[PDB]
């Protein structure tokens, strides 16, 4: 005989370890149908911030247009949701991005040869040859002069290698962001495993 | 395709949530059906699958080049010793239960790391459809051509199939 | 797979004692996304109750 009072008297949680990335906690006497659903929602249904529309004003280097457009969307942005809100695709382009639904990013890098002597370290040999994730700069749109002032939009691991360049080459882009379910695409996924 | 001759279409892009997790929470990538093997007998895929385990921690050129190896000195029993010198699951059946369910399963699930390829002659430009379309000027028949996208041919020996069903208001 | 312990020991699973591991994406703390999951299901439970049956 099951009643929800009786669930309460024999349900336990053993939080064995709880870190800032990888939490590990035990459960007791809950059915598998509920416990899978908690696994089910944490991959799909918890929403997250991700880059969605990428506007390249100039892409000159060897990494192509569509490949580097794909990598920027993969970049996990260290911004809590319930700050943005959803987009609504029943309304056109100039109404679809507001001050409230879209973190707006941009990235501008040119490479030029640094005079150095050699067999040569290719950081010392060219200026800005690596395009790390910590070159993505937040641009404050709208009312975002104090509502992201404490937390500027920082990529959660700022050492992602977005591109490599050579002198002459440049990448000049503008990438919007959005809040969305992980059930659509695998860049909104709020969990590693 | 793997490197043993197992072709196969990407039949359905399956969501990662209703897909079985593993020992750790590993979810696989390419589910291949174990009914495919007994007509093929490609055991080289099975020994590649557990030496991908045994290459993913160790760093020597894993001698999958054959024939320095006997029946007594089987390379799945010469470097079957590597399974027992780091404590592997020696029968290769790695832990991997279903998810959509929430249980462990009957089998333990054979799971591994098999080097897959991707084939050239792809099929994303094949289908065509025609409601009423163009004609031909000689016969007022639908015009032949994949690139004009007209004229599925009902040949000589499909007319001699629709008679075979006894039907004729299909052949009409 | 041994002879000596072929029958002296058996293996089983405690069929209700789960061990969740929840790693993070770097945006959120892992205990908090578990709080988001247990209320999304509650957000999904109320919303069917707050939905009337027409045909």
């Amino acid at each position: 005989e099951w009643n929800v009072e009786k669930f309460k008297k024999d349900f336990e949680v053993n939080i064995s370890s709880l870190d800032a990335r990888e939490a590990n906690f035990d459960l007791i006497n809950i059915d598998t149908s509920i416990a899978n659903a908690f696994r089910r929602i944490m991959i799909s249904e918890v929403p997250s911030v991700a880059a969605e529309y990428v506007y390249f004003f100039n892409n000159t280097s060897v990494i192509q247009d569509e490949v580097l457009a794909h990598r920027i969307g993969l970049v996990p942005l260290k911004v809590d949701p319930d700050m943005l809100t959803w987009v609504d695709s029943n309304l056109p382009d100039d109404e679809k991005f507001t001050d409230e639904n879209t973190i707006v990013l941009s990235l501008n890098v040119k490479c030029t040869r640094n005079p150095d002597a050699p067999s040569t370290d290719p950081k010392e040999l060219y200026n800005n040859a690596h395009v790390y994730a910590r070159d993505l700069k937040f641009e404050p749109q709208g009312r975002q002069s104090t509502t992201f002032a404490d937390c500027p939009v920082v990529p959660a691991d700022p050492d992602i290698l977005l591109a490599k360049l050579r002198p002459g080459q440049e990448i000049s882009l503008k990438a919007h962001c959005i809040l969305g379910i992980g059930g659509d695409h695998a860049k909104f996924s709020p969990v590693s495993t | 395709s793997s490197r043993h001759g197992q072709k196969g279409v990407c039949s359905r892009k399956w969501p990662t949530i209703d897909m079985p997790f593993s020992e750790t929470g590993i979810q696989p990538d390419i589910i291949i059906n174990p009914h495919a093997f007994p007509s093929r007998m490609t055991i080289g895929m099975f020994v590649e699958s557990l030496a991908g385990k045994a290459g993913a921690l160790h760093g020597i050129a894993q001698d999958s080049t054959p024939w320095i190896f006997n029946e007594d000195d089987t390379p799945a029993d010469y470097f079957g010793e590597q399974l027992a010198k780091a404590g592997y699951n020696y029968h290769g059946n790695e832990p991997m239960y279903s998810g959509a369910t929430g249980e462990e399963l009957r089998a333990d699930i054979y799971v591994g790391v098999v080097y897959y390829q991707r084939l050239r002659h792809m099929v994303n430009d094949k289908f065509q459809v025609r409601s009423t379309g163009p004609v031909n000027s000689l016969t007022m028949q639908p015009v032949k051509g994949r690139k004009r996208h007209g004229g599925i041919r009902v040949g000589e020996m499909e007319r001699d199939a629709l008679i075979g069903h006894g039907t004729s208001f299909l052949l009409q | 797979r041994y002879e000596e312990f072929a029958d002296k020991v058996k293996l089983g699973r405690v069929r209700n004692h789960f061990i969740f591991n929840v790693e993070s994406a770097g945006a959120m703390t892992p205990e908090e996304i578990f709080f988001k999951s247990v209320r999304i299901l509650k957000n999904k439970a109320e919303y069917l109750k707050n939905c009337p049956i027409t045909q």
């Binding site: - | 020992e23 020597i60 010198k85 780091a86 404590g87 | 591991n21």
Partner: peptide, 24 residues
């Protein structure tokens, strides 16, 4: 019929979950 030179110096790495360095 001697065998091939054994990998001088293997070590063990197939180990468990939730534990970091508990092999001694």
């Amino acid at each position: 019929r001697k065998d091939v030179p054994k990998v001088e110096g293997l070590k063990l790495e197939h180990f468990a979950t939730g534990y970091d360095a508990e092999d001694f």
